[PDB]
Amino acid sequence: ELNPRLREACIALNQQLNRPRGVTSRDGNAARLVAQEWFRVSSQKRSQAESVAGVLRGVKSLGPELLAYVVNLADGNGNTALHYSVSHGNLAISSLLLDTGVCDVNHQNRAGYSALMLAALTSVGQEEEDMAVAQRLFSMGDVNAKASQTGQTALMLAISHGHQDMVAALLECGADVNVQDADGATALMCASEYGRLDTVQLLLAQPGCDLTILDNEGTSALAIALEAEQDEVAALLHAHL
């Protein structure tokens, strides 16, 4: 059940949302008060799924539009509760939000990243449940989306942090290897700079992987490897070229 102040703000917000035209400002008194309590309860590192679950039961009792509005609230950093739960590794909260069936997992924060992208970036190598959460995100998102500022993909972000299992998972979900970021860089280029040989091998094994894509200064994966002094990567790229 909702605490007295939040309940009243939710009732007021629900009233705005449920009008025939549904006209509702994210910047009204009601929405700001709901946001303040929602982020307080849902999005802290110490937030507890039990508490969030009780807020959601309360929100849901007022109706589906309110539930979807609240779950997908974005703060001044463009972050939703799911951004925070993924980033913080609060798996229980992640599961609880995804269980609502209403998360917009492709929503990009101000920095340009979706929850899907942050899951690729912050992949916990030894957490089977971390990977299960990421796979749920992939199933309801666009694994080939590009981040609004840098143009990077989940695949590139996973590569950049040496998250090999995440790389494999994204390729099994249909990640395109040949997407280019804002600077023209590809997943292979990121992998060639990072220097993990198994990741380079896995990318090279994908049908259609193109070794001759260039970035906007005409740089190839091979050149990046040589510049990074990754000789074994460089030699491997030479052999496929």
* Cα–Cα dist 92/119, whole Å: 14
What's the burial of 160, exposed, middle or buried (CB within 10 Å: 0-12/13-18/19+)?
Answer: middle
Structure tokens at 81: 């509760």
Q: Are 151 and 183 in contact (CB under 8 A)?
A: yes
Q: What total of structural domains would you count in the chain?
A: 1
Structure tokens at 118: 């942050």
Q: Are 236 and 228 in contact (CB under 8 A)?
A: no
Among residues 30, 5, 27, 3, which one has the least CA distance to residue 15? 30
Buried b (16+ CB within 10 A) or exposed e, 49-70: beebeebbebbeebeebbbbbb
Structure tokens at 153: 């993909």
Interacting residues of 153 by C-beta distance below 8 A, sequence separation 6+? 117, 143, 144, 145, 146, 147, 175, 176, 179, 181, 187
* Cα–Cα dist 193/202, whole Å: 15
* Cα–Cα dist 175/51, whole Å: 36
* Cα–Cα dist 205/140, whole Å: 26
φ/ψ (deg, to 5) at 77: -95, 5
What is the number of other CB atoms lying within 10 angstroms of the CB of residue 178?
12
User: Residue 164 belongs to what H/E stretch?
Assistant: helix 164-172
What's the CA angle centered on 164, arms 163 and 166, to 5 degrees? 70
Resolution stated for this PDB structure, in Å: 1.8
Q: Range of 118's domain?
A: 1-241
φ/ψ (deg, to 5) at 76: -70, -15
Sign of the alpha-carbon dihedral angle for 69, 71, 75, 80: negative
φ/ψ (deg, to 5) at 37: -75, -35
The DSSP output letter for 112 is S
Query: CA dihedral defined by 220, 169, 205, 221, rounded to 10 degrees?
Result: 10
